[PDB]
Design a protein around this ligand. Structure first.
Ligand code: SF4
Ligand code: SF4
Ligand code: SF4
Ligand code: SF4
Ligand code: SF4
Ligand code: FES
Ligand SMILES: [K+]
Ligand SMILES: [Zn+2]
Lengths: 113, 114, 126, 208, 150, 171, 230, 376, 96, 95, 48
């Protein structure tokens, strides 16, 4: 379609969205491979990433991609994929699939007092 | 009894921060007197800083003295930059309050304060 | 690790900003409030109240309003049980007087006692 | 129960409970409790040391996308030993939802700041230090924003009185605005408005 | 000296120059008074932003503890003669926020107040009445007669 | 549902002629001159007054029964509902045993003029009346006692009763 | 131990035999509404506020008088319990005078509190209320029997604790008045205590009358020194 | 300072005359409302909300009433909902008039201020007729409203709404096409969508940056889903797009006011549960239950079930929210007020980087900031 | 409306619109300052039968918040809500 | 009918009057002491007593919804007249 | 009164010259209106 503006200030339009989306999805799969299998975040993020990759593989039209993926403009989809890759790097950094670090006191979530 | 530290691991580091804060305050007392056109001597302000430091010198908890050091840093930042007024600096020197009685006979004469 | 050990009593009189005279000379009171005898509900005697003493309240020179000098005259705090109230009172250095709660004794009410045969519990009117 | 009673939505309650299970299963290191209120509002209660690795998840995951920080609040409950209750309110625009993330801290325990996640907190938690005394670690510019410059004490603590400890007046003797001990012309009349009968049966705490 | 007193009282009361010192709700009420409905400018009342060229000051809003030195300095920079008109309830006795920890209980403690205008916010017609009362107070001044007697 | 604000040789010549000859500036000046030639909305105060309503919240007053006996019965609902705590009531039974008041003080520099007391009074004794031109010169003059409130009620009864008669069916 | 097991709202609790339904519900932690029952007076059971429903039983029992049995499930907040409470409040407020702003019990009244938290919010009574003439029993109790609800705490206190036996109920039906039938000055050493045990504003402390109000008062605990009882 | 909104202390590091570091020192109007609220009941704490944002009074009343009604599990009658929406749109027009005219006065065009302050006085007269006070109505209450509309008011509302669009067109001719007004706001205060969401901006700022978000269209309240209206969306993030958005919001407010005046249903004005809303004065003096409920409602206050909620409404400045926590008594345990002005003044540091000082006062003007709301 | 016809025409030309059609000053066309007394309608629960308070109480139906997970199969990835639908361009004034 | 204390001050209907040695009377010099001259008791005293034909009588103060809540007064006694709690009006029976 | 003027200018008052002993030829006050005329003048009712 070659839209001049996306309607949002400070969001440049990408010329080829399919290659960028495929590169980002392959990269997030490669990064998520390092997570242990028992983690729930790895399972759910791998599931949604594979679903989005299948959607972007099946159809070539940009407008039908924006309607099927329902993530708005494809620039927002690319930005969300980049943010998820950053979250995956921070996730292998933090390792939050371990159990509870500490237990709260007995009067910590009791409302009312 | 296991607590999370903020800045000071032990009492020695907290005392180092206290000495640093006193060094900075003793440095900046003459500029505070000169810039605000305060009508007191430099010695009065410096011994006021000494009096406050000796007043808050009963604490053995590293976290409490660390927070005291932080709040002194806030006061130093509000004094070094001209964000206060003449009255905000002069509020330390109580000049309008009459001297309260301290012995038992005078307090018995005045009122019911125990 | 990222943790240190502090083995001293929590005293935060220096960070609450209160003046000195309202720390050592004020006697706090930790108690369960008594039920108002004009009513019959006991919901108001469920939680512990921490209060302070009453200072002077003189008359105003204009119309005799209640002019006061105590800033802590309207400070009422609510705690779930006794131990947290004691911990909060000793945390701010306030000397405290603690009164234990007074649970009423479970009575033995019998409706037939008003219609006895050889007892003094025979009622005179109904 | 039609005209004067608020209608009840169950699909939103079910979806919020499912998302709460989703969050509590993705992050078992820090999440302590998940509760959905009667008016369909999710609440997540986590450990303080997991303030930062949770929030960025809710800012960066494709299934949450809580990109807005609406309100940041601390609540003072003097009964608990961790008397300060930090509350983050998050808003997701892509999914059109609101979530609440709650944690606890005492006076001397620092909390990790959230300016690395939401920049609006650059003011918000700063105001918290002005009002309660909760120290935030690695804040860029932490200074008092609401109270007076020379004010000592944190006013929003429940042990702080309604009227302060000092009051200002102009003095011709020193030509200056000075602070004096507080002396009110009329005392604040304290009212006992609590009815001594049981308020709600459904909120009945078990006895001792 | 009686008639010369009558002259300078007429000159000061018919060219009052207030200053743009509002703080709160009551400032919006002052701006509503300055609207074409009530037209302060017809009374010789034109807003001047500098304290050095102002005659009276209408304190509109809540005077907090962070605001008392500012109000005191602004009042002290005004040339004589100066009159202060309290406005609303916040600047009268604290009003709604009388018992608060950071509100001055009436701006009388900082500046000497000449005319008290009660309301929350006072209606612009009532404010015009208060300004006319201040004008009538200026009219009955007796400076030169008292100077002649002394 | 949504719209795009600001998303829009003859035209270039028209724009250059507007630049050089100031067409839209002349249009704005014409509208300014249009507002010059209209009738100004300045009402001649104090000989003219602005429009008001029978529900207007002004000066506090204490009404009376149509037999001379005062209306307040010392029930202390107004001082319990007052959000500013501006009302101070001290009560005792007088000589005939009627529950009346001895002190009824309203701090008018504390009052926020919100009309909760005029709607919480069970006998319509306290009324936020219609008077708004009651500015004073001293702070103590804005501190009404019971005698001043009763005098205000006896002063403004002739219109307070009419306003209540006009408005009481909406409550 | 002979403590039998009963149920309150499906929760088990063990009580001694002879324990009433009200006592069992208090032991669990719910304070059952009441007007005539007092824990230091003989049981009267003549206000029907305490009517609760035991399950598998087609009648509401008086919790202030009826003893419990094994396996009884006290449905404290079912539909018919609330219906009975609302009906009792409607009957109680059917003949009560509109005297709250002149009352000295306002703000500390059991009838107002229980009417808000248990009763309905509007009146179906479109007729004229009764008006009972006032009496006098001395300069210690201001006496307004228009507001009495015939709870009969007066007679039980004057017969059991005070032990003077001069108060009574004269009449039959809606014209029954709680009085003394003569110009008798009820004066004992514990007379003023009746002012504490009137759930309505029928009996008022005469020196205290028309002087203060409960919500504006500050309560301070202290010790009596006029005698050696303490 | 006239360009300052009465209480403000902007300390700026002028590098000659451009700003490199701007810091708004606030707190000159910190009254401490959120400590005075917990010492008062809900009816007594209702007039405190009239004075936070004193150009958006009824919207704050609506937000507080929505919070209390969400906690109380009750809803107002439909006539009360339509009245609330109509007066909220009148409030939106009030705020937009004040903001646009004060911004134009702070830039230098001082005529539309006097042109539309008489219309603002007309709406103040409408408030006077409907509630009894020109500014602080205390009209919207938990349970609906406080009083019904007087007879003959809606004809005045219809006449004013009929004749107000010509004034809107007059203002839009006087400022939008003016070249001097344009050149002050072409590329001043530009913001991006990522920095709009990450800085906590809400309302027009988001709609200045092309972000499509409005609380009246996504999370609707009382009757706003039964009214059709448009939402303006900017395209550059400058002050020009925000001013155009405010003018278009005024036009849509006129549209909503027309829809409200053509669709008001008959009925009552309070929740008929007398334990929350007070009873009528006619039946208070006849029924005993109504007298008891009036006594205890105006002396103690209705109880609220324990719990914490955070509600949010589309205030004329943005998103106005309250976090209300109740412990079961007749007084709130903790009432926190979330305001758009706090985050807007926080983002003022980022929005004003690289501009001249007159552009900083233009950026101050283009944020509709009321500092009583900001300082709470 | 107390202005001559030439001033009327001059104002109409210089403003570009018919100013006298929609005046900004009020006249006799508004409603009268006095009104007949109304008869306010009643609410829905002002009945006499089948109107027990327990069947329509709003405050008593509030429940405590339900704890989902407490610290004392391949489940699909869920969302807090379905995603917000794309906004429709207004057909009345699209500004395009 | 105001009474005059011999310090010169008028006496209010609540009975308050400043003593001759009280310094607070200096607040009244150069000014006036404002006191209502319409005494409530001396204005309700001369209102006549109404004889009714029934045992009990209902009083609302007149005006319907403009007065006090309606209270029923019993006139069973033949010695004292039944006085209204709010308005102060007194009724009786002709027998 | 004059009904041909616009709203707010349709009712007015000319004050007296001597009210309660003071010369009001120039010191005209806004609070010299009796309550019935105060009700009429501020446009509260159409009945004088
Ligand atoms: S007096 Fe009232 S209107 Fe004026 S600033 Fe104070 S709260 Fe606002
Ligand atoms: S109007 Fe409001 S603030 Fe004023 S006295 Fe009455 S209740 Fe109090
Ligand atoms: S509400 Fe009315 S009757 Fe009650 S004390 Fe106040 S003024 Fe008197
Ligand atoms: S006894 Fe209670 S319900 Fe009866 S009038 Fe007195 S306060 Fe009202
Ligand atoms: S006067 Fe009171 S205590 Fe005595 S029987 Fe009547 S209601 Fe009961
Ligand atoms: S309490 Fe049982 S019938 Fe009265
Ligand atoms: K009693
Ligand atoms: Zn009567």
């Amino acid at each position: 379609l070659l839209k001049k503006t996306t309607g949002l200030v400070g969001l440049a339009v990408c010329e080829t969205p399919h290659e960028r989306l495929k590169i980002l999805y392959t990269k997030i799969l490669d990064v998520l491979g390092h997570i242990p299998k028992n983690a729930a975040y790895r399972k759910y993020t791998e599931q949604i990433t594979n679903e989005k990759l299948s959607i972007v593989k099946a159809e070539p039209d940009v407008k039908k991609l924006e309607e099927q993926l329902q993530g708005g403009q494809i620039e927002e989809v690319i930005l969300q994929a980049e943010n998820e890759l950053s979250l995956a790097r921070k996730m292998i950094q933090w390792k939050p699939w371990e159990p509870l670090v500490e237990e709260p006191p007995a009067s910590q979530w009791k409302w009312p007092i | 009894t296991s607590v999370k530290p903020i800045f000071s691991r032990d009492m020695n580091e907290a005392k180092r921060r206290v000495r640093e804060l006193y060094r900075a305050w003793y440095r900046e007392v003459p500029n505070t007197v000169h810039l605000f056109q305060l009508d007191i001597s430099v010695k009065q302000g410096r011994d006021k800083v000494r009096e406050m430091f000796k007043k808050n010198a009963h604490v053995t908890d590293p976290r409490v003295v660390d927070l005291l050091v932080i709040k002194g840093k806030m006061e130093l930042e509000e004094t070094i930059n001209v964000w206060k007024q003449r009255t905000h600096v002069m509020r330390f020197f109580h000049e309008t309050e009459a001297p309260r009685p301290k012995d038992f006979l005078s307090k018995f004469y005045v009122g019911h304060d125990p | 690790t990222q943790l240190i050990t502090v083995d001293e009593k929590l005293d935060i009189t220096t960070l609450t900003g209160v003046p000195e005279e309202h720390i050592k000379t004020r006697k706090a009171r930790i108690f369960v409030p008594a039920r108002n005898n004009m009513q019959s509900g006991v919901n108001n005697t469920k939680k512990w109240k921490m209060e302070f003493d009453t200072r002077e309240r003189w008359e105003n020179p204009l119309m005799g309003w209640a002019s006061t000098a105590d800033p802590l005259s309207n400070l009422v705090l609510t705690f779930s049980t006794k131990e947290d109230a004691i911990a909060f009172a000793e945390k701010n250095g306030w000397s405290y007087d603690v009164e234990e709660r007074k649970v009423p004794k479970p009575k033995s009410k019998s409706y037939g006692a008003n219609f006895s045969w050889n007892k003094r519990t025979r009622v005179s009117t109904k | 129960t039609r005209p004067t009673v608020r209608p009840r939505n169950d699909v939103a309650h079910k979806q919020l409970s499912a998302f709460g299970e989703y969050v509590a299963e993705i992050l078992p290191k820090y999440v302590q409790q998940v509760q959905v209120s009667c008016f369909s509002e999710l609440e997540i209660c986590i450990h303080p040391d997991g303030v930062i690795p949770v929030l960025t998840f809710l800012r960066d995951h494709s299934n949450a996308q809580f990109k807005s920080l609406a309100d940041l609040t601390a609540v003072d409950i003097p009964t608990r030993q961790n008397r300060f209750e930090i509350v983050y309110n998050l808003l997701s625009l892509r999914f059109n939802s609101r979530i609440r993330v709650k944690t606890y801290t005492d006076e001397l325990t620092p909390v990790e700041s959230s300016v690395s996640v939401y920049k609006a907190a650059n003011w918000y938690e700063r105001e918290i230090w002005d009002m309660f005394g909760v120290f935030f670690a690695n804040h860029p510019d932490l200074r008092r924003i609401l109270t007076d410059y020379g004010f000592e004490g944190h006013p929003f603590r429940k042990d702080f009185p309604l009227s302060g400890y000092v009051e200002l007046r102009y003095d011709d003797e020193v030509k200056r605005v000075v602070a004096e001990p507080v002396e009110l012309a009329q005392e604040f009349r304290k009212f006992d408005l609590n009815s001594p009968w049981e308020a709600f049966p459904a909120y009945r705490q078990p006895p001792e | 000296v009686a008639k010369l007193d009558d002259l300078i009282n007429w000159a000061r009361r018919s060219s009052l120059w207030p200053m743009t010192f509002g703080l709160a709700c009551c400032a919006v009420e002052m701006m509503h008074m300055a609207a074409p409905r009530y037209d302060m400018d017809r009374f010789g009342v034109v807003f001047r932003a500098s304290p050095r060229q102002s005659d009276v000051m209408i304190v509109a809003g809540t005077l907090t503890n962070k605001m008392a030195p500012a109000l005191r300095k602004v009042y002290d920079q005004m040339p004589e003669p100066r009159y202060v008109v309290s406005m609303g309830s916040c600047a009268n006795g604290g009003g709604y926020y009388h018992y608060s920890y950071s509100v001055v209980r009436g701006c009388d403690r900082i500046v000497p107040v000449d005319i008290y205008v009660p309301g929350c916010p006072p209606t612009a017609e009532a404010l015009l009445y208060g300004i006319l009362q201040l004008q009538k107070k200026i009219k009955r001044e007796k400076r030169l007669r008292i100077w002649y007697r002394r | 549902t949504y719209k795009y604000v600001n998303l829009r040789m003859k035209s270039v010549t028209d724009r250059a002629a507007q630049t050089l000859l100031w067409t839209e500036l002349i249009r704005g000046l014409g509208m300014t001159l249009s507002y010059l030639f209209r009738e100004p909305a300045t009402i001649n105060y104090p000989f003219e007054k602005g429009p008001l309503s029978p529900r207007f919240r002004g000066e506090h007053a204490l009404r009376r029964y149509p037999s001379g006996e005062e209306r307040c019965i010392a029930c202390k609902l107004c001082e319990a509902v007052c959000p500013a705590q501006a009302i101070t009531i001290e009560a005792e039974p007088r000589a005939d045993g009627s529950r009346r008041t001895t002190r009824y003080d309203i701090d008018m520099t504390k009052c926020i003029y919100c009309g909760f007391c005029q709607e919480a009074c069970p006998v319509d004794a306290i009324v936020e009346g219609p008077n708004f031109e009651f500015s004073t010169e001293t702070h103590e003059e804005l501190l009404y006692n019971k005698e001043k409130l009763l005098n205000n009620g006896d002063k403004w009864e002739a219109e307070i009763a009419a306003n209540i008669q006009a408005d009481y069916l909406y409550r | 131990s002979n403590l039998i097991e009963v149920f309150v709202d499906g929760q088990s609790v063990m009580v001694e035999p002879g324990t009433t339904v009200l006592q069992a519900c208090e032991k669990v932690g719910m304070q059952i509404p009441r007007f005539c029952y007092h824990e230091r007076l003989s049981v009267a059971g003549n206000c029907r506020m305490c009517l609760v429903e035991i399950e598998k039983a087609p009648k509401v029992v008086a919790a202030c008088a009826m003893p419990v049995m094994k396996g009884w499930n006290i449905l404290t907040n079912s539909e018919k319990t609330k219906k009975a409470r609302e009906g009792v409040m409607e009957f109680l407020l059917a003949n009560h005078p509109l005297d709250c702003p002149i009352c000295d019990q306002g703000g500390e009244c059991d009838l107002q509190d229980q009417s808000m938290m248990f009763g309905s919010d509007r009146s179906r009574f479109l007729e004229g209320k009764r008006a009972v003439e006032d009496k006098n029993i001395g300069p210690l109790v201001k006496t307004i029997m228009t507001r009495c609800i015939q709870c009969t705490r007066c007679i039980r206190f004057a017969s059991e604790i005070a032990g003077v036996d001069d108060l009574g109920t004269t009449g039959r039906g809606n014209d029954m008045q709680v009085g003394t039938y003569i110009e008798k000055m009820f004066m004992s050493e514990l007379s003023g205590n009746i002012i504490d045990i009137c759930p309505v504003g029928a009996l008022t402390s005469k020196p205290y009358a028309f002087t203060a109000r409960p919500w504006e008062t500050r309560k301070t605990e202290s010790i009596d020194v006029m005698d050696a009882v303490g | 300072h006239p360009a300052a909104h009465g209480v403000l202390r902007l300390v700026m590091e002028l590098s000659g005359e451009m700003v490199r570091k701007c810091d708004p020192h606030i707190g000159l109007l910190h009254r401490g409302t959120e400590k005075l609220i917990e010492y008062k009941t809900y009816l007594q704490a209702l007039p405190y909300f009239d004075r936070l944002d004193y150009v958006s009074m009824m919207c704050n009343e609506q937000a507080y009433s929505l919070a209390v009604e969400k906690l109380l599990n009750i809803q107002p009658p439909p006539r009360a909902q339509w009245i609330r929406v109509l007066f909220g749109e009148i409030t939106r027009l009030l705020n937009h008039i004040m903001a646009v005219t004060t911004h134009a006065l702070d830039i230098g065009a001082m005529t539309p201020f006097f042109w539309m302050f008489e219309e603002r006085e007309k709406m103040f007269e409408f408030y006077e007729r409907v509630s009894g006070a020109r500014m602080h109505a205390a009209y919207v209450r938990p349970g609906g409203v406080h009083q019904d509309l007087p007879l003959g008011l809606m004809d005045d509302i219809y006449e004013f709404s009929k004749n107000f669009s010509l004034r809107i067109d007059e203002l839009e001719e006087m400022l939008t096409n003016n070249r001097i007004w344009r050149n002050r706001t072409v590329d001043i205060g530009v913001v991006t969508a990522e920095d709009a969401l990450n800085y906590g901006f809400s309302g027009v700022m988001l709609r200045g940056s092309g972000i499509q978000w409005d609380l009246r269209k996504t999370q609707p309240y009382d009757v706003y889903d039964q009214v059709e209206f448009d939402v303006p969306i900017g395209s550059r993030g400058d002050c020009y797009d925000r001013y155009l958005c405010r003018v278009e919001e005024m036009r849509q407010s006129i549209r909503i006011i027309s829809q409200c005046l053509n669709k008001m249903p008959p009925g009552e004005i309070k929740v008929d549960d007398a334990k929350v809303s007070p009873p009528k004065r006619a039946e208070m003096k006849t029924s005993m239950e109504s007298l008891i409920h009036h006594f205890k409602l105006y002396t103690e206050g209705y109880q609220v079930p324990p719990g914490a909620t955070y509600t949010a409404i589309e205030a004329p400045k943005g998103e106005f929210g309250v976090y209300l926590v109740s412990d079961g008594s007749s007084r709130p345990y903790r009432c926190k007020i979330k305001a758009p002005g706090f985050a807007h003044l926080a983002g003022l540091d980022k929005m004003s980087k690289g501009h001249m000082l007159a552009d900083v006062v233009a950026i101050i003007g283009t944020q509709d900031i009321v500092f009583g709301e900001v300082d709470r | 409306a107390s202005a001559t016809r030439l001033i009327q025409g001059l104002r109409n030309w210089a403003s570009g619109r018919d100013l006298q059609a929609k005046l900004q000053l009020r006249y006799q066309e508004i409603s009268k300052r006095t009104q007949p007394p109304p008869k306010l309608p009643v609410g829905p629960s002002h009945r006499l039968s089948n109107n027990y308070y327990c069947a329509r109480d709003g405050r008593r139906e509030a429940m405590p918040p339900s704890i989902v997970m407490s610290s004392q199969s391949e489940k699909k990835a869920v969302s807090p809500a379905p995603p917000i639908k794309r906004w429709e361009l207004s057909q009345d004034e699209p500004y395009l | 009918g105001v009474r005059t204390s011999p310090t010169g001050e008028k006496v209010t209907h609540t009975g308050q009057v400043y003593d001759d040695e009280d310094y607070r009377r200096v607040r009244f010099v150069g000014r006036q002491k404002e006191v209502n001259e319409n005494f409530a008791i001396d204005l309700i005293a001369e209102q006549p007593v109404s004889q009714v034909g029934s045992r009990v009588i209902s009083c609302d103060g007149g005006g319907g919804a403009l007065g006090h809540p309606r209270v029923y007064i019993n006139l069973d006694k033949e010695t004292k007249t039944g006085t209204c709690g709010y308005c102060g009006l007194q009724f009786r029976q002709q027998h | 009164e004059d009904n041909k003027q616009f709203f707010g200018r349709h009712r007015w008052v000319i004050y007296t010259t001597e009210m309660n002993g003071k010369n009001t030829f120039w010191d005209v006050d806004g609070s010299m209106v009796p309550p019935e005329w105060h009700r009429w003048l501020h446009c509260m009712t159409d009945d004088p």
